[PDB]
Amino acid sequence: XVTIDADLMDAADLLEGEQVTIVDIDNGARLVTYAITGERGSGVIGINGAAAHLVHPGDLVILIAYATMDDARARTYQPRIVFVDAYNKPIDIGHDPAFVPE
Amino acid sequence: XVTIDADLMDAADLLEGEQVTIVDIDNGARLVTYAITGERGSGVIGINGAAAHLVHPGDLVILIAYATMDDARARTYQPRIVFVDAYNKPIDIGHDPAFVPE
Amino acid sequence: XVTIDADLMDAADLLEGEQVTIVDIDNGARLVTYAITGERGSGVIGINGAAAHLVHPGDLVILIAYATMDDARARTYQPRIVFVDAYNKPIDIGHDPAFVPE
Amino acid sequence: XVTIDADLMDAADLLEGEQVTIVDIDNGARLVTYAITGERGSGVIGINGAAAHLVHPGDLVILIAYATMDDARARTYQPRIVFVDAYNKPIDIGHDPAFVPE
Amino acid sequence: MLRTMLKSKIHRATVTCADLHYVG
Amino acid sequence: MLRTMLKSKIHRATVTCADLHYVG
Amino acid sequence: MLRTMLKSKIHRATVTCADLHYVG
Amino acid sequence: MLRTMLKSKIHRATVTCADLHYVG
Ligand SMILES: [N+]
Ligand SMILES: [N+]
Ligand SMILES: [N+]
Ligand SMILES: [N+]
């Protein structure tokens, strides 16, 4: 795969090559791939190759990465949660995966 | 995703954000997501977003988390197994994934 | 899940609770679960709960576990490969996942 | 599973037994297995067992392996990307998963 | 060497709600 | 002992393109 | 750096029972 | 903290054989 706007990768603490799970709100597909850096500021969320069987243009998707860490660290760990607008621009960054803005 | 009663998360040694596999007894669906803390004592098992394609209200589900650990530790490791009643209240906590109460 | 004859778990270096992938030769199903110790010498390969949607009695299955390890160790690592007969008794143990006896 | 030409395993930094994800360009199948060393220089990409339900001869596939590593290392990590020709011979090796030759 | 081991199980829990538009 | 924890989420993103022949 | 490697294989085992209500 | 990163890719490889009874 998935090509992500560099701005979105930075906002979400995703590195080029980092494993990424994609889930599709529209059809319920779930798959695992890796991030590819997309043109900064373009808003690209591009699905390449095999994954285009499961994800289609215009779909609403969630992108997820996981970390493995010591138990002690996991108890204080804070995720990077990035809410985007209709143009895939980051409008809110926080700790709560269930937070919705406005 | 999955919103879990805080009482159930504590009983099962699940942290907010911890990866969780869900398997559905009724339809056989299997998916991977993360835990979101639900209102303590409410009995909430809530399926949010994309996963609602695969899991439906009233379904019986199993929630599973895994740990990675040194071989030496794994030989003495004891899981946290939480059996719940019809209202998602914890009625038994033990080491045996196959134990059933009464 | 999957209940495995203790003899088979020992032969394959599987611990109780260890994550296990099951693939089904007959129908092509692939799923991830954990091992439960079965009665020693019974030959039990039991599929419990949700996984019984995908795996049926009499199916031929492969059981797989993975380890995570340092690059240096992985270059010399030797898996535990257990070939079984029609009664799920271990007849050969070796290093080669592609080896077939007789 | 998947039997891979030893030349391709070496080119891609894959060890015998290393976990491998296969995605199928033709039908969109996605599965997880491990690498088996194939005859060096033969161009073999062989799908064995259960995975032959999902992958068929003549399909175009992508083979992927992942590593787990410290955050500091991940920021400078460079993958091994192997582009092959119509005969599964390596024609380009680089760092960019999205690079296409000529 | 690291093994992956079961650490938590909540079993035969009843899903109380399931909807595409709920976030968490 | 190691836990697997959510670390990044980008949510309700709109797929801008999706095609079998694009590589990245 | 960590690799994920096959460590155990039991192959062409015959499933002896498979039922939705058995727990283990 | 550990990240999971792509380390190997072989792409647009052609499957030369695929059969249920071959072991490896
Ligand atoms: N959500
Ligand atoms: N690609
Ligand atoms: N069970
Ligand atoms: N095999």
Side-chain angles (χ1 to χ4, degrees), chain A, chain B, chain C, chain D, chain E residues 1-21 23-24, chain F residues 1-21 23-24, chain G residues 1-21 23-24, chain H residues 1-21 23-24:
Chain A
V2 59
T3 301
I4 305 171
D5 187 329
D7 282 340
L8 289 182
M9 302 197 54
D10 293 351
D13 190 20
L14 291 176
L15 301 178
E16 167 129 42
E18 182 155 11
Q19 193 182 81
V20 158
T21 297
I22 310 178
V23 304
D24 192 312
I25 297 293
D26 293 282
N27 61 39
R30 314 180 70 81
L31 63 104
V32 176
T33 184
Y34 54 94
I36 286 159
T37 300
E39 178 175 296
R40 185 176 297 281
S42 63
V44 61
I45 301 287
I47 297 281
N48 320 306
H53 282 266
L54 304 174
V55 179
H56 312 299
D59 285 1
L60 290 174
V61 295
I62 321 281
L63 309 173
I64 291 295
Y66 295 92
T68 311
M69 66 192 70
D70 197 85
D71 192 288
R73 176 64 186 133
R75 287 183 185 278
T76 64
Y77 189 72
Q78 296 288 354
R80 190 76 75 75
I81 313 298
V82 181
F83 198 93
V84 302
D85 71 0
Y87 299 104
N88 295 332
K89 300 303 131 78
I91 59 180
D92 182 89
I93 310 184
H95 297 330
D96 183 355
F99 168 77
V100 176
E102 299 111 32
Chain B
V2 59
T3 301
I4 305 171
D5 187 329
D7 282 340
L8 289 182
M9 302 197 54
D10 293 351
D13 190 20
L14 291 176
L15 301 178
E16 167 129 42
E18 182 155 11
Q19 193 182 81
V20 158
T21 297
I22 310 178
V23 304
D24 192 312
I25 297 293
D26 293 282
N27 61 39
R30 314 180 70 81
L31 63 104
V32 176
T33 184
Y34 54 94
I36 286 159
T37 300
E39 178 175 296
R40 185 176 297 281
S42 63
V44 61
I45 301 287
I47 297 281
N48 320 306
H53 282 266
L54 304 174
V55 179
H56 312 299
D59 285 1
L60 290 174
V61 295
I62 321 281
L63 309 173
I64 291 295
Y66 295 92
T68 311
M69 66 192 70
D70 197 85
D71 192 288
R73 176 64 186 133
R75 287 183 185 278
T76 64
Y77 189 72
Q78 296 288 354
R80 190 76 75 75
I81 313 298
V82 181
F83 198 93
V84 302
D85 71 0
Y87 299 104
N88 295 332
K89 300 303 131 78
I91 59 180
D92 182 89
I93 310 184
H95 297 330
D96 183 355
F99 168 77
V100 176
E102 299 111 32
Chain C
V2 59
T3 301
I4 305 171
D5 187 329
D7 282 340
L8 289 182
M9 302 197 54
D10 293 351
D13 190 20
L14 291 176
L15 301 178
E16 167 129 42
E18 182 155 11
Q19 193 182 81
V20 158
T21 297
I22 310 178
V23 304
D24 192 312
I25 297 293
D26 293 282
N27 61 39
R30 314 180 70 81
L31 63 104
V32 176
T33 184
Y34 54 94
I36 286 159
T37 300
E39 178 175 296
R40 185 176 297 281
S42 63
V44 61
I45 301 287
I47 297 281
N48 320 306
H53 282 266
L54 304 174
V55 179
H56 312 299
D59 285 1
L60 290 174
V61 295
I62 321 281
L63 309 173
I64 291 295
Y66 295 92
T68 311
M69 66 192 70
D70 197 85
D71 192 288
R73 176 64 186 133
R75 287 183 185 278
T76 64
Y77 189 72
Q78 296 288 354
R80 190 76 75 75
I81 313 298
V82 181
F83 198 93
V84 302
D85 71 0
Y87 299 104
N88 295 332
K89 300 303 131 78
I91 59 180
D92 182 89
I93 310 184
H95 297 330
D96 183 355
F99 168 77
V100 176
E102 299 111 32
Chain D
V2 59
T3 301
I4 305 171
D5 187 329
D7 282 340
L8 289 182
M9 302 197 54
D10 293 351
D13 190 20
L14 291 176
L15 301 178
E16 167 129 42
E18 182 155 11
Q19 193 182 81
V20 158
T21 297
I22 310 178
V23 304
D24 192 312
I25 297 293
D26 293 282
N27 61 39
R30 314 180 70 81
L31 63 104
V32 176
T33 184
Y34 54 94
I36 286 159
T37 300
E39 178 175 296
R40 185 176 297 281
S42 63
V44 61
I45 301 287
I47 297 281
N48 320 306
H53 282 266
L54 304 174
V55 179
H56 312 299
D59 285 1
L60 290 174
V61 295
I62 321 281
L63 309 173
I64 291 295
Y66 295 92
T68 311
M69 66 192 70
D70 197 85
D71 192 288
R73 176 64 186 133
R75 287 183 185 278
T76 64
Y77 189 72
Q78 296 288 354
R80 190 76 75 75
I81 313 298
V82 181
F83 198 93
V84 302
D85 71 0
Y87 299 104
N88 295 332
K89 300 303 131 78
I91 59 180
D92 182 89
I93 310 184
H95 297 330
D96 183 355
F99 168 77
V100 176
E102 299 111 32
Chain E
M1 195 218 65
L2 303 184
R3 289 186 206 241
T4 308
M5 308 288 289
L6 166 80
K7 67 165 277 283
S8 313
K9 182 176 175 175
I10 299 176
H11 59 313
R12 320 253 170 174
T14 297
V15 178
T16 62
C17 38
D19 187 83
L20 278 164
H21 322 96
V23 186
Chain F
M1 195 218 65
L2 303 184
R3 289 186 206 241
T4 308
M5 308 288 289
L6 166 80
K7 67 165 277 283
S8 313
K9 182 176 175 175
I10 299 176
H11 59 313
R12 320 253 170 174
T14 297
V15 178
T16 62
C17 38
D19 187 83
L20 278 164
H21 322 96
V23 186
Chain G
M1 195 218 65
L2 303 184
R3 289 186 206 241
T4 308
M5 308 288 289
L6 166 80
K7 67 165 277 283
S8 313
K9 182 176 175 175
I10 299 176
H11 59 313
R12 320 253 170 174
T14 297
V15 178
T16 62
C17 38
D19 187 83
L20 278 164
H21 322 96
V23 186
Chain H
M1 195 218 65
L2 303 184
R3 289 186 206 241
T4 308
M5 308 288 289
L6 166 80
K7 67 165 277 283
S8 313
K9 182 176 175 175
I10 299 176
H11 59 313
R12 320 253 170 174
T14 297
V15 178
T16 62
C17 38
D19 187 83
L20 278 164
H21 322 96
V23 186

